[PDB]
């Protein structure tokens, strides 16, 4: 299949050459004066040479599935995978996950208290008897908590002085509460009516800047339940605001350059740190939040629906809920919560060391046959229908024994996956044949590994003073080749490549022909530096995810993809994260052809064949006019305005899209004769 010889001293050093590398233990396999590295070829070649089939060693990766009794863990099995991983070779172990049901719930209502959230506070101040009612079906005795929030106390987020601070309420001043940011009004409790009444109590407030500072509240909530308290089972939150959201960096406005620590420090169920403290970064939640098994449920105006939509992409376990400005259909949010919140099955892992690389597979229940990708995104599984993730762990070198975990984001079930550096092959000892190797060496699967000072395929020679005549037979590749290809002095038939104390430099081979320095370069680096690929006798063996003569096409990925997720839009192969746009179409993703004339000609005939019905001329239309779309909307971009078949000026824009002659038109409902 494939096997290039690295320095081969033992059966193990033949293994460290590549996947398609096999080794032969059968003794007397070395000819009168043949190299010991010949024992390391491909399985096919070995049989063609004579090497027996049962003599072909091939130490392989496999998986140990030590399954538990039961109740150990619930729907993440196996529970303990002790893999024996050989470098370069992938070990595969499956993961059965059949979610069951619903555990003890624990909600928390993060509501923005602004003057815009007035009729929201009214139509919501006490509708919690239907929440436990909506909780009754699936889960049983859950918990209910509340937390208010507005925006940082200090400006520029809201006027800090003066007594409009005591009275922010615009115009009405109905005794609204002082400007705040996070007030833990209610703790997680069983009761429901006590919860409702403790809410209506507090009234709204107000601030200056339009977007809110609700992000600071997020952390402070799930930061120290040593004062807020939280169930050890489930924890769902729900964001609610008819306004934006401020993240890290914005704090520099308020003269505060102290970043977010992560822990809340309140003394009266009320923040007094957010002022001397900067906003939680956008990504400081998907970590801390998902660490405490908490998951917000976006539910805001339709004005802020597609902004939290992009936020759903990033952070895990989060749904989008477009609702009216009255927060009346707020309870239907959770009918849509479990809908696709008990659907996002995740399967990530603790940040593994760089010396390892992990991947997964996916076999969703409804049709999907995915393969090879991190995560376990299957948004098509709910209650009692198992799934399948094929975890494939590979190493680059002989790792040191360690252990990591593969958790499901938003789940307490830890799977302690043990990892064992498997890098050996095992035969015999030095009680058998202290004779051969002339006493100064031991034997292992045929060949003999000599001492520090003895060398040779039988520990016969010494590194001080040897040669013969026709021992130089297999010491040169051919009769017209220099001995040991230079850079190597022949001893006892074989060659001992010389050594260079130069970074990277290394000679090797029977005749010392191959080096690990003289290959194809890239970006002023050998085979693309140590990162991309490596060098081995001219050809570059690029690391995984990199191909090309010298890893020149660095990435096998496709940054050639746009948000449309179609490569290079209209035309252009995706070579090395670059597009080869046809015609004058320009980079990066081939959409704008700056030089293209702007053909409205030849399009008039079809423009009056779609909007107007003035006779598909040449033939019919929808055939001679593959500009199939004619949206009933104000599209724009290529503002065209030419004439019709007979006199009248027919106006119409022309928004092209993606590939070749594909278009999208809106022909003005008007003419001019």
């Amino acid at each position: 299949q494939e096997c290039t010889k690295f320095k081969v001293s033992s059966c193990r050093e033949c293994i460290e050459s590549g996947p398609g590398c096999t080794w032969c233990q059968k003794l007397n396999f070395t000819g009168p004066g043949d190299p010991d590295s010949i024992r390391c070829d491909t399985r096919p070649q070995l049989l063609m040479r004579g090497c027996a089939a049962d003599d072909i060693m091939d130490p392989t990766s496999l998986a140990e599935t030590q399954e538990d009794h039961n109740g150990g863990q619930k729907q993440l099995s196996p529970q303990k995978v002790t893999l024996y991983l050989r470098p370069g070779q992938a070990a595969a172990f499956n993961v059965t996950f059949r979610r069951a049901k619903g555990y003890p719930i624990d909600l928390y209502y993060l509501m923005d208290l602004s003057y815009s959230m007035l009729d929201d506070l009214r139509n919501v101040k006490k509708l919690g008897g239907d929440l436990l009612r909506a909780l009754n079906e699936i889960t049983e005795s859950g918990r209910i908590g509340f937390g208010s929030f507005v925006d940082k106390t200090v400006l520029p987020f809201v006027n800090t002085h003066p007594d409009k601070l005591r009275n922010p309420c615009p115009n009405k001043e109905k005794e609204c509460q002082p400007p705040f940011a996070f007030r833990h009004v209610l703790k997680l409790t069983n009761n429901s009516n006590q919860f409702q009444t403790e809410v209506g109590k507090q009234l709204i407030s107000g601030n200056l800047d339009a977007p809110e500072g609700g992000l600071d509240a997020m952390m402070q909530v799930a930061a120290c339940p040593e004062e807020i308290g939280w169930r050890n089972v489930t924890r769902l939150l729900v964001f609610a605001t008819d306004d934006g959201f401020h993240f890290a960096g914005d704090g520099k406005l308020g003269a505060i350059l102290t970043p977010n620590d992560g822990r809340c420090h309140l003394e009266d169920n009320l923040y007094k740190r957010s002022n001397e403290f900067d906003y939680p970064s956008v990504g400081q939640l998907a970590h801390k939040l998902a660490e405490n098994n908490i998951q917000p449920i976006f539910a805001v105006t339709s004005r802020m629906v597609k902004t939290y939509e992009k936020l759903t992409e990033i952070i895990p376990k989060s749904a989008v809920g477009e609702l009216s400005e009255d927060s009346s259909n707020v309870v239907q949010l959770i009918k849509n919560a479990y809908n696709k919140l008990s659907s996002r099955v995740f399967l990530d892992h603790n940040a593994l060391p760089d010396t390892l690389k992990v991947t997964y597979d996916s076999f969703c229940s409804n049709g999907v046959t995915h393969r090879n990708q991190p995560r376990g995104d299957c948004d098509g599984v709910q209650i009692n229908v198992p799934i399948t993730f094929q975890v494939k762990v590979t190493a680059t070198e002989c790792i040191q024994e360690q252990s990591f975990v593969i958790r499901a984001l938003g789940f307490t079930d830890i799977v302690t996956v043990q990892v064992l550096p498997q890098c050996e092959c095992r035969c015999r000892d030095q009680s058998r044949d202290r004779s051969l190797c002339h006493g100064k060496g031991f034997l292992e699967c045929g060949i003999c590994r000599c001492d520090t000072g003895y060398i040779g395929k039988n520990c016969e020679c010494q590194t001080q003073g040897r040669s013969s005549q026709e021992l130089e037979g297999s010491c040169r590749k051919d009769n017209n080749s220099i001995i040991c290809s230079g850079l190597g002095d022949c001893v006892c038939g074989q060659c001992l490549c010389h050594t260079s104390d130069v970074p990277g430099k290394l000679i090797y081979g029977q005749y010392c022909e191959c080096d690990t320095i003289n290959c194809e370069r890239y970006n002023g680096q050998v085979c693309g530096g140590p990162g991309r690929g490596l060098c081995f006798c001219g050809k570059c063996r690029c690391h995984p995810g990199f191909e090309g003569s010298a890893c020149q096409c660095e990435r096998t990925t496709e940054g050639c993809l746009n948000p449309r997720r179609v490569e290079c839009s209209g035309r252009g192969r995706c070579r090395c994260n670059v597009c080869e746009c046809h015609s004058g179409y320009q980079l990066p993703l081939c959409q704008e052809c700056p030089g293209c004339p702007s053909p409205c000609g030849k399009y008039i005939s079809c423009a009056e064949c779609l909007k107007f019905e003035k006779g598909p001329f040449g033939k019919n239309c929808s055939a001679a006019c593959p500009g199939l779309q004619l949206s009933n909307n104000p599209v724009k971009g290529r503002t065209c305005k030419e004439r019709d078949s007979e006199g009248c000026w027919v106006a119409y824009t022309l928004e092209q899209q993606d590939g070749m002659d594909r278009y999208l038109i809106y022909v003005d409902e008007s003419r001019e004769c």
Partner: protein
């Protein structure tokens, strides 16, 4: 890779928010910021100037008006060099308008002049909606030849902008209009930077929160325009794409080449951070922050891209280098990075240095928040860097990087066979070979003449046949197989030859004896401590080896004739223009009609514009190259040319056998070389060239160059047909406007040709047609009439109503052009009263007359790149449909 991490200066002035924002003042001083240095009643902060002479910071005098309150100045800083000035700012002024106060911002201009204050100090009186109440102008500032520029954030719907101040003339301002519906709450102007050019200046503002993701927008200030050039959305939500920005100069041409961007809070799997490189394409409505790359690091929650500044040429390879902060690295500890340019729009993802907060920074939490460098302040020659940190601010100088060239030779070229096979009655007469090595430093521009740039001590370490445990010789001075001696270098060579002793009798003779040197920079004491530590560059081939061949025994006689020939060609090579045909495939064949050549070498001569790259082909081919060979490029000729030798490394070339291999030379898209490029091929054996007439093989090729030349028919074109046609009038003059432009990369003369119909069987089509050339000098154009083939035009246009020049006596206009500079959109139009008389001549209606416009240029020397683009031949078809 030369940022001092030992002997530096540290200013630890404990003043609250001290060392939170810093800038390079006039070269002599560095200004730090302490916004939270409480003064009076919840008022300003204060500034501090620090000098190198004495490690101490002196307060700076300021007339803080009672008007400006809680402005916490110093938060935003900025300095120019033009004349040396500085700009400090309180971006948090509080003015009480009763019901509610707001934030205006107040800045101060200092220097060796008048202490100006310039919003300017029209204390901004009091007045959903907003206008300019909480715009905190001066939040970020940067200078420019035509007056400073401060940035507002809360402009209107917190859209943003930047107030430009001219020379005592009333200031202007640039928002994004209101017609721009979006951009609500984006802090446009959070960060600001210049973008000078060979032409007019260009500003840039950072909008961290455009649609809550982050976009960066670039603006131009054309005469009576001040519109937008272009922009680029963010990559991810919350990424904060727009935080930091830095226009940097990959080279030193003085025109800003590219622009960096910040997004400390970005990720996909690791939240290290994100900086984005985004060159500055010219030609609005197109601009990509994706000239590929974007620097990062393998450490989550690092805030990488928090700040950054142009540092300039530090390593002296003509390639400016930049610095980037990341105060979130490690356990909240600080961090900084160093990158280098390459060629034009690009940087090197792999950084050379990563000085972090682990550098016996005893105990500072986050460092690198901000930083600005490029100025020589310690007055030791080369530039310096200033990086602010919580509590204190540090200065890292740039250690001199010199590199040296070396020459190796063996006085006795080869070995005379005298002390070769030897004999055993009487002696070892050990032959005496001499090996002379020389050392000289050449690339010096930065360090300049004088102390340091000259004197240095060095340790030398010569060693023969290292890789083998069979020393083929020894030096006499020490008697060992190697030796070392510390000797003084200079910009002027230093040559010393050493004595070598070859034993009369030896086994291996075929393999020349190698001699390599390990050399470095020992001691590093040089006069004063104003150099401290010099060092070498990245590409330090400190291991240089030279070979000594032997007089190979070609028999007990026969004299050993060295006879080798050589000949090469270029398979399929057609025309070779610079741009296409980057790789250059050479098929070299070679002979051996004499004695066996062992270490046969084959060297080429070529213009600077190319070098050799390993082919490494496999897969498969052919009757053909098989061949591991070692090649070493190197500069030779007086000025321009240089040789790339290539010795067939490890095997023999025997008998009258011929062999063919493939050697490819990459050629640069900007290859400076004559209208013709020649190249040769010296061929010889390992045993050198013992005799007279060299066997060199050369050939000379015509060279051309790539160019992008395009032309369109502007949509201001007269298609005017209409039914009112009672008589045969004259003047409804039509207007064919043609716009042209070249996206090539070289200034090149051109000549734009035209074709406008007129005479048509004595019946003029449209008369007195001339061509205007607005927005450009009065150029000279030619005029010539010509008569078409004269076919039956009756049936001709009956096919197609068109009226090309092939029917009606056309008119060619040859508008020559001195030098069509690249990027120049030189455009112009042509008009003439269009007669209605000829319309009847052909007896039809709805006819249409066409003009063809085709650009040309010397087919030789220049040529269009992609294959073949007809983008240099536009067309405009007007219609004369007039009925009744």
């Amino acid at each position: 890779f030369n940022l001092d991490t030992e002997e530096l200066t540290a200013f630890r002035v404990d003043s609250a928010g001290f060392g939170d924002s810093v800038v390079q003042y006039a070269n002599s001083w560095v200004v730090v910021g302490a916004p939270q240095k409480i003064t009076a009643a919840n008022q300003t902060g204060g500034l501090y100037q620090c000098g190198y002479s004495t490690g101490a910071c002196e307060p700076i005098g300021l007339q803080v008006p009672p008007e400006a309150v809680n402005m916490s100045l110093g938060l935003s800083l900025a300095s120019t060099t033009s004349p040396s000035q500085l700009l400090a700012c309180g971006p948090t002024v509080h003015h009480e308008c009763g019901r509610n106060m707001y934030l205006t911002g107040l800045c101060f201009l200092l220097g060796p002049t008048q202490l100006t204050q310039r919003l300017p100090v029209s204390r901004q009186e009091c007045p959903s909606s907003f206008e300019l109440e909480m715009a905190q102008e001066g939040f970020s500032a940067v200078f420019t030849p035509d007056g400073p520029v401060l940035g507002a954030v809360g402009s209107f719907t917190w859209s943003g902008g930047a107030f430009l101040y001219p020379p005592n003339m009333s200031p202007t301002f640039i928002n994004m209009s209101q017609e721009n519906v979006d951009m609500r709450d984006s802090y446009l102007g959070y960060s600001t930077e210049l973008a000078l050019w060979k032409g007019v200046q260009s500003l840039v503002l950072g909008a961290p929160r455009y649609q809550h993701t982050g976009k960066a927008v670039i603006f131009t200030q054309v005469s009576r325009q001040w519109r937008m050039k272009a922009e680029v959305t963010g990559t991810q939500i919350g990424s904060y794409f727009g935080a930091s920005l830095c226009s940097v100069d990959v080279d030193s041409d003085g025109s800003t080449d590219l622009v960096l961007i910040g997004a400390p809070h970005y990720y996909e799997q690791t939240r290290g951070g994100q900086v984005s490189v985004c060159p500055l394409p010219r030609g609005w409505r197109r601009w990509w922050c994706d000239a590929v790359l974007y620097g990062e690091q393998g450490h989550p929650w690092g805030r990488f891209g928090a700040a950054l500044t142009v540092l300039g040429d530090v390593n002296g390879d003509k390639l400016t280098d930049v610095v980037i902060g990341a105060p979130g690295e490690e356990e909240n500890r600080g961090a900084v990075y160093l990158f280098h340019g390459v060629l034009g729009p690009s940087i090197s993802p792999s950084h050379s240095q990563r000085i972090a907060g682990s550098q016996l920074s005893s105990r500072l939490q986050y460092f690198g928040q901000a930083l600005s460098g490029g100025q020589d302040l310690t007055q030791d020659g080369l530039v310096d860097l200033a990086v602010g940190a919580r509590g204190q601010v540090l200065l890292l100088r740039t250690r001199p990087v010199l590199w040296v060239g070396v020459s190796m030779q063996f006085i006795p070229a080869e070995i005379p066979r005298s002390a070769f096979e030897c004999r055993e009655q009487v002696v070892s007469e050990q032959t005496l070979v001499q090996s002379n090595i020389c050392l000289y430093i050449d690339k010096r521009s930065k360090n300049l003449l004088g102390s340091r740039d000259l004197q240095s001590s060095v340790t030398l370490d010569l060693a023969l046949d290292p890789g083998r445990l069979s020393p083929r010789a020894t030096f006499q001075e020490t008697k060992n197989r190697s030796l070392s001696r510390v000797r003084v270098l200079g910009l002027k060579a230093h040559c010393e030859n050493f004595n070598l002793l070859l034993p009369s009798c030896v086994e291996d003779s075929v393999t020349p004896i190698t001699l390599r040197l390990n050399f470095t920079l020992v001691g590093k004491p040089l006069l004063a401590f104003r150099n401290l530590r010099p060092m070498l560059a990245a590409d330090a081939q400190r291991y240089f080896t030279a070979s000594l061949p032997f007089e190979k025994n070609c028999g007990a006689d026969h004299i050993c004739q060295d006879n080798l020939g050589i000949s090469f060609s270029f398979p399929g090579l057609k025309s070779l223009l610079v741009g296409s045909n980057l790789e250059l495939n050479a098929e070299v064949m070679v002979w051996n009609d004499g004695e066996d050549s062992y270490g046969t070498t084959i060297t080429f001569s070529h213009p600077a514009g190319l070098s050799y790259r390993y082919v490494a082909e496999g897969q498969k081919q052919g009757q053909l190259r098989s061949l591991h060979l070692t090649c070493d490029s190197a500069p030779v000729g007086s000025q321009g040319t240089w040789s790339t030798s290539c010795r067939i490394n490890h095997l023999i070339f025997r008998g009258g056998a011929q062999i063919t291999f493939l050697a490819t030379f990459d050629v640069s898209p900007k290859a400076v070389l004559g209208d013709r490029l020649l190249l040769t091929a010296n061929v010889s054996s390992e045993n050198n060239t013992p005799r007279t007439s060299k066997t060199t093989f050369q050939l000379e090729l015509p060279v051309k160059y790539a160019v992008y030349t395009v032309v369109s028919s502007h949509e201001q074109f007269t298609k005017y047909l209409n039914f009112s046609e009672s008589e045969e009038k004259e003047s409804h003059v039509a207007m064919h406007r043609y716009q042209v432009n070249n996206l090539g990369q070289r200034d090149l003369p051109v000549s734009i040709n035209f074709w406008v119909p007129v005479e048509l069987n004595q019946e003029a089509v449209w008369m007195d047609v001339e061509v205007s050339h607005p927005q450009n000098p009065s150029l000279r154009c030619s005029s010539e009439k010509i008569a078409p083939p004269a076919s039956d035009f009756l049936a001709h246009i009956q096919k197609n109503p068109v009226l090309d020049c092939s029917i009606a006596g056309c008119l060619r206009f040859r508008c020559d052009v001195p030098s069509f500079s690249v990027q120049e959109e030189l455009d112009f139009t042509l008009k003439g009263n269009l007669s209605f008389g000829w319309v009847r001549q052909i007896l039809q209606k709805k006819v249409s007359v066409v003009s063809v416009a085709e650009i040309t240029f010397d087919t030789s020397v220049y040529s269009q790149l992609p294959g073949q683009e007809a983008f240099m031949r536009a067309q405009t078809t007007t219609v004369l449909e007039k009925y009744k």
